[PDB]
Design a protein around this ligand. Sequence first.
Ligand SMILES: C[C@@H]1CC[C@@]2(OC1)O[C@H]1C[C@H]3[C@@H]4CC=C5C[C@@H](OCC[C@H](CO)CO[C@@H]6O[C@H](CO)[C@@H](O[C@H]7O[C@H](CO)[C@@H](O)[C@H](O)[C@H]7O)[C@H](O)[C@H]6O)CC[C@]5(C)[C@H]4CC[C@]3(C)[C@H]1[C@@H]2C
Ligand SMILES: C[C@@H]1CC[C@@]2(OC1)O[C@H]1C[C@H]3[C@@H]4CC=C5C[C@@H](OCC[C@H](CO)CO[C@@H]6O[C@H](CO)[C@@H](O[C@H]7O[C@H](CO)[C@@H](O)[C@H](O)[C@H]7O)[C@H](O)[C@H]6O)CC[C@]5(C)[C@H]4CC[C@]3(C)[C@H]1[C@@H]2C
Ligand SMILES: C[C@@H]1CC[C@@]2(OC1)O[C@H]1C[C@H]3[C@@H]4CC=C5C[C@@H](O)CC[C@]5(C)[C@H]4CC[C@]3(C)[C@H]1[C@@H]2C
Ligand SMILES: C[C@@H]1CC[C@@]2(OC1)O[C@H]1C[C@H]3[C@@H]4CC=C5C[C@@H](O)CC[C@]5(C)[C@H]4CC[C@]3(C)[C@H]1[C@@H]2C
Ligand SMILES: *[C@@H]1O[C@H](CO)[C@@H](O)[C@H](O)[C@H]1NC(C)=O
Ligand SMILES: *[C@@H]1O[C@H](CO)[C@@H](O)[C@H](O)[C@H]1NC(C)=O
Lengths: 309, 622
Amino acid sequence: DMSILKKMKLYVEDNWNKCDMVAISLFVVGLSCRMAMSTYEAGRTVLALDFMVFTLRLIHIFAIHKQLGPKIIIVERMIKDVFFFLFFLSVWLIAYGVTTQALLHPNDPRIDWVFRRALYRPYLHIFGQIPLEEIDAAKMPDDNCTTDVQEIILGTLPPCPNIYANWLVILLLVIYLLVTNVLLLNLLIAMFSYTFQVVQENADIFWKFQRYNLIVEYHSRPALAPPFIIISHITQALLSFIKDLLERELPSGLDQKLMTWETVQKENYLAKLEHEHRESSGERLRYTSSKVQTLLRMVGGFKDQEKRM
Amino acid sequence: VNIKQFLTYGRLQELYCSVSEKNLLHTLLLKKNQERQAQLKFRFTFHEVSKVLKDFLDDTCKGFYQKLNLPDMDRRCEHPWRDLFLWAILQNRQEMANYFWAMGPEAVAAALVGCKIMKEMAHLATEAESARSMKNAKYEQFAMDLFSECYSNSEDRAYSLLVRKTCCWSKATVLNIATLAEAKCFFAHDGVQALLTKVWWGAMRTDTSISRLVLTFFIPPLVWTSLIKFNPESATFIRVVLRRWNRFWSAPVTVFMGNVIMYFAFLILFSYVLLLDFRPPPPYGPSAAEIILYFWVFTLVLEEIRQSFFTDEDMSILKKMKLYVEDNWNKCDMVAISLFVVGLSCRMAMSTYEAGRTVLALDFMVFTLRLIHIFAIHKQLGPKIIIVERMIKDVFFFLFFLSVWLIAYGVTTQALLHPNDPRIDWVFRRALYRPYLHIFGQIPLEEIDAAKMPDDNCTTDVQEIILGTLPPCPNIYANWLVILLLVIYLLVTNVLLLNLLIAMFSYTFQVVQENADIFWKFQRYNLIVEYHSRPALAPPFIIISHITQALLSFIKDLLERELPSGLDQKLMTWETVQKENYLAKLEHEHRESSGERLRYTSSKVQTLLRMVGGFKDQEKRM
Ligand SMILES: C[C@@H]1CC[C@@]2(OC1)O[C@H]1C[C@H]3[C@@H]4CC=C5C[C@@H](OCC[C@H](CO)CO[C@@H]6O[C@H](CO)[C@@H](O[C@H]7O[C@H](CO)[C@@H](O)[C@H](O)[C@H]7O)[C@H](O)[C@H]6O)CC[C@]5(C)[C@H]4CC[C@]3(C)[C@H]1[C@@H]2C
Ligand SMILES: C[C@@H]1CC[C@@]2(OC1)O[C@H]1C[C@H]3[C@@H]4CC=C5C[C@@H](OCC[C@H](CO)CO[C@@H]6O[C@H](CO)[C@@H](O[C@H]7O[C@H](CO)[C@@H](O)[C@H](O)[C@H]7O)[C@H](O)[C@H]6O)CC[C@]5(C)[C@H]4CC[C@]3(C)[C@H]1[C@@H]2C
Ligand SMILES: C[C@@H]1CC[C@@]2(OC1)O[C@H]1C[C@H]3[C@@H]4CC=C5C[C@@H](O)CC[C@]5(C)[C@H]4CC[C@]3(C)[C@H]1[C@@H]2C
Ligand SMILES: C[C@@H]1CC[C@@]2(OC1)O[C@H]1C[C@H]3[C@@H]4CC=C5C[C@@H](O)CC[C@]5(C)[C@H]4CC[C@]3(C)[C@H]1[C@@H]2C
Ligand SMILES: *[C@@H]1O[C@H](CO)[C@@H](O)[C@H](O)[C@H]1NC(C)=O
Ligand SMILES: *[C@@H]1O[C@H](CO)[C@@H](O)[C@H](O)[C@H]1NC(C)=O
């Protein structure tokens, strides 16, 4: 008993369910395009992407593992620092790449190659891919290059790089390499270290809380793994047409006994708290001070009476 | 003793003249007195204390004692507790200053003024003990605690208390005094941040999701729907829809995001002009998009100038220029505009066309860097900006170490490998450029290892080497030493220095993050204050708003508001009551402390011992 729309909303709420929906949609689209001949290659591409989606689903499958689940939670938390580093790197990379593309190839109309030399190459500079053959004049090859735009567009010859102020290009490359490959990367390492230290303890508790729900799900899951699971599904459907260790209901006597036992344990726990409060140092100090004040006034009266005699 | 009747102005000046002569206040008063005598009954006149207060605050203590120039010497002070607190504060007497603050009418402003004056005198302090006491004035702590009490009490009168114009401190807003004091911890308080968030979202509700706001921004008509909830409070209907439109588009957050979107449009247009639509000199004419870009930047500079200079009605032009050039990001802005002007000028010519293109290429980088300062206000990004700004120092330390090691290794290898290359450019190349690239996995062994050196056509003659006919042959006399030095350099640089820098960044992050958050909040206050007066139209449109403002000025605030006399007095009495409650709570917590109870018990036990001993002696006598 639950609303169908509410169930759909609850399902689509989870991100891993969104990944599952993406996977099944890609499978359907790829199969449909594969069935045709004019869209065969597109279907193959979509299925290739779907394999990646399923292999990623494998992580959510392993989420219940006792040693791996907290790591999944930790990575899910690290995503935020990843995004911060992405913002910084994106700003710096846009700047450096567009500036170098303007300084080096100011007469290349090809939009694809503009975007290439502006963003793809500076991005690969991070991972040790620094092709100086296109950036340093002393290292630029004596290849057959053209300056004419027409010939450049047709792709007859590669466009010659501009070497007007190449010292500026090399200086900018040096500064970009320093900033990106040192400051940003080591800053991200520090951010991950701090985030790990602050998050791990909460990640363990969250893993336990999620483990409860995963075990609850595994309770009703049929014992047969897919693709066999169809036998169990058919059996369940046939049984439903023809016709739990957790969340059990107990007899009245046992239920009342457990309720009284809970009440007794609660009384014991409250008595222990109160006793520990009475024996606390602060409470003892307060009691001693109050009783000393009372004793002072009373013994002062007694001493006055004694002096009267 | 009735302080109101006790403290006359003559008595106040008598107190000021009777300084200890061994503290900082006496030295400052002597300096002011000598300056006044050079510019030309009582050792010091109210002019000297007024000038000292002018040095310390420069805006608040105006007319405190100059208004009447001296007032009647027998006339009682209008604000006795304020003057007493100020007097006790100028001389580092903190216990007395505290007592006077506990009696003053406006306590938050007084505490902020006190902390400002203390941190101002901390620099001028001669003795180390006095400076240490001044740095621990904890007067900002008093303001934070009292405002926490006030915020817990009402949370609606607290905002009015923050934004009201105080009567004692020359119509100065409490937030204005906190800004003057640079009380960063005060701005970090949850109440001040909540008020700033309320200002940030304008008429909209602060809980509005960012995605809904962006979607409503991109599709304007959805403002009239119920997608975003608003805070409460033919001709009528038009007025209603216009009011809703204005209440949405006047919110500071919408103005900020519009500015960000149009700055992204600027970066896109600048890149397009620089990469695809950069035409020959004006003989063939700059592109129309280039003219649009020039107009764009003109509007941006107009907005910058207006924000920096025309926001303040009364302030020295030279002082405003100094304040503007003080900020580093303003220096970056000046560099950007100067580069734009130089690049445009060189582009207008034909003999300097390429130089102009190069300068504009650099300017694009400068503007894309300006984008970070634009995003500084973001709730999740700003602290990261602060953290990076702090990391710069460790970057410099690593740079020093790397520079020393790199100079050594590079010059040694250049001497060992190419001892007969006269070309200065290639000497500097092989000495510094190549060892620098060794850090990033660029190790060209083809020029360093003889077993890997190519059978290319090389010359040994210097003449031929200089002319560039053939590349100079590398020396292979002792190449085992070159390879050993390369190995040692690779080890040191790529392992020790890099992992040391990683450790330094880790430690710096851990130590800095908490202060960076508070500094972000303190800066966020000023950014929201700036967004208050910023016109709601993002550039290049902003020119319409500028023209409208100029026309309105020729023809003719939620923060820092002034309240009616009755409400002002009510809030002052409420502040006094909250201060009394806070002090009573502190005193009660002090009485119930374990140490105080132990002291009381010990003293009373001693008294009881002696008294009961006397009683026992009396009993034994019977
Ligand atoms: C510790 C810290 C590290 C980072 C840094 O600061 C210090 O290091 C600094 C070092 C510096 C660099 C030091 C040196 C230079 C060189 C200088 O050019 C000199 C001007 C001349 C005039 O155009 C250029 O020369 C000639 O160009 C020609 C290109 O047409 C070459 O023709 C080639 O044609 C064909 C190529 O296919 C082949 O026949 C041959 O290959 C060759 O014949 C010549 O061979 C070559 O002679 C430009 C500046 C630069 C790169 C410095 C930049 C800044 C640094 C990296 C510093 C860092 C901040
Ligand atoms: C764990 C730790 C790591 C770091 C380290 O310590 C341990 O490792 C050690 C290893 C060691 C190195 C071990 C070995 C050597 C070799 C030694 O040369 C032997 C002397 C002879 C005499 O000149 C040189 O040989 C010959 O040179 C000729 C150059 O004219 C080559 O001609 C080439 O000509 C043309 C090239 O275009 C082509 O025809 C062919 O390419 C080739 O014919 C010959 O082929 C080659 O036979 C020099 C020292 C060196 C590099 C050691 C240095 C120190 C280490 C890195 C240690 C670390 C601390
Ligand atoms: C991470 C972002 C995604 C979006 C984007 O920038 C990076 O991707 C880039 C890829 C570019 C493509 C790459 C190749 C070609 C082919 C060429 O004949 C015509 C131009 C066109 C379509 C380009 C148009 C602009 C595009 C989408 C860029 C776009 C801003
Ligand atoms: C980070 C520092 C900046 C300053 C500096 O060292 C690194 O830059 C280096 C670049 C060098 C240039 C590079 C190219 C040439 C061209 C050549 O035909 C004549 C010599 C000259 C001008 C060189 C002179 C010495 C220079 C400025 C070096 C200078 C100490
Ligand atoms: C470049 O193209 C020209 C066309 O005539 C040809 O003569 C020359 O040999 C080519 N050079 C190279 C390096 O391919
Ligand atoms: C080097 O130059 C000489 C000049 O005569 C030439 O004979 C020889 O073939 C050249 N070798 C190479 C590898 O270019």
